[PDB]
């Protein structure tokens, strides 16, 4: 590994501390009464898929 | 000599306008470890004292 | 932007009625309760750019410290302008110019 730059990436990687606030960009709150559907527009296509 | 030396600071203070142009436009490569504003300040800081070793 | 108690002006409160499944911004001292329009309740923006560019004012031209540059203005086409670098100032910010005209005060980048 020590002679490969492709393995030792890995290996960086795999050691480096990564929670969900570093990747996360935003976070929202919304009322939604329907599990089986939603209210908001653009999230609709894909939880229909998703239930389909 | 003179004339030496004043063109190698002339040619770093070029240099420097240079790469604050670039990162003033986001064309700055980033130093792994350091935000934009240290990777320019250190770039800069290394400029001129290479400026003032050669004219030395 | 949240709204008040159009009676009471204390903050209204998000709440949601069993029976009809509908939410409702309910005052806590008073019984008012007005329908809500959107399902976004709450946000939380882990990273933001507000701040960047809302720091503008209509007479920053005449401030003498500003640099002055000859950038063209996409509206007003002018000689002049004044240019400067981003008023919100973390650890991490970019260093893009803002650039400002004299007579529309449009806020555009050469990017
Ligand atoms: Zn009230
Ligand atoms: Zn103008």
Redesign the interface.
């Known amino acids: 590994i020590a002679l490969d730059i492709e393995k030792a990436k890995v290996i960086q990687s795999s050691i480096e501390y990564t929670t969900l606030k570093n990747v996360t960009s935003a976070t929202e709150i919304y009322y939604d009464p329907d599990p089986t559907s939603t209210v908001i527009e653009e999230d609709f296509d894909t939880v229909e898929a998703y239930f389909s | 000599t003179m004339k030496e030396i004043t063109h190698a600071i002339s040619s770093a203070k070029e240099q420097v306008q240079e790469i604050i142009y670039k ?4 064309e700055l490569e980033l130093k792994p470890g350091m ?3 240290e990777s ?1 300040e250190g770039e800069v800081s290394r400029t001129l004292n290479d400026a003032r070793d050669s004219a030395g | 932007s949240f709204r008040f108690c159009l009676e009471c002006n204390n903050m209204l409160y998000p709440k949601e009625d069993k029976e009809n499944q509908r939410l409702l911004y309910s005052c806590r001292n008073c019984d008012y309760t007005e329908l809500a329009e959107d399902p976004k309740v709450y946000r939380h923006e882990l990273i933001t750019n507000i701040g960047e560019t809302a720091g503008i004012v209509d007479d920053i031209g005449q401030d003498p410290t500003l640099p002055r540059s000859d950038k063209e203005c996409p509206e007003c086409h002018s000689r002049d302008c004044v240019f400067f670098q981003s008023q919100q100032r973390r650890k991490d910010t970019n260093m893009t110019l803002f650039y400002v005209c004299l007579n529309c005060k449009k806020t555009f980048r050469d990017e």
Request: charged content about 10%; cysteine-free.
């Open positions: 990162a003033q436009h986001n935000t934009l504003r320019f």
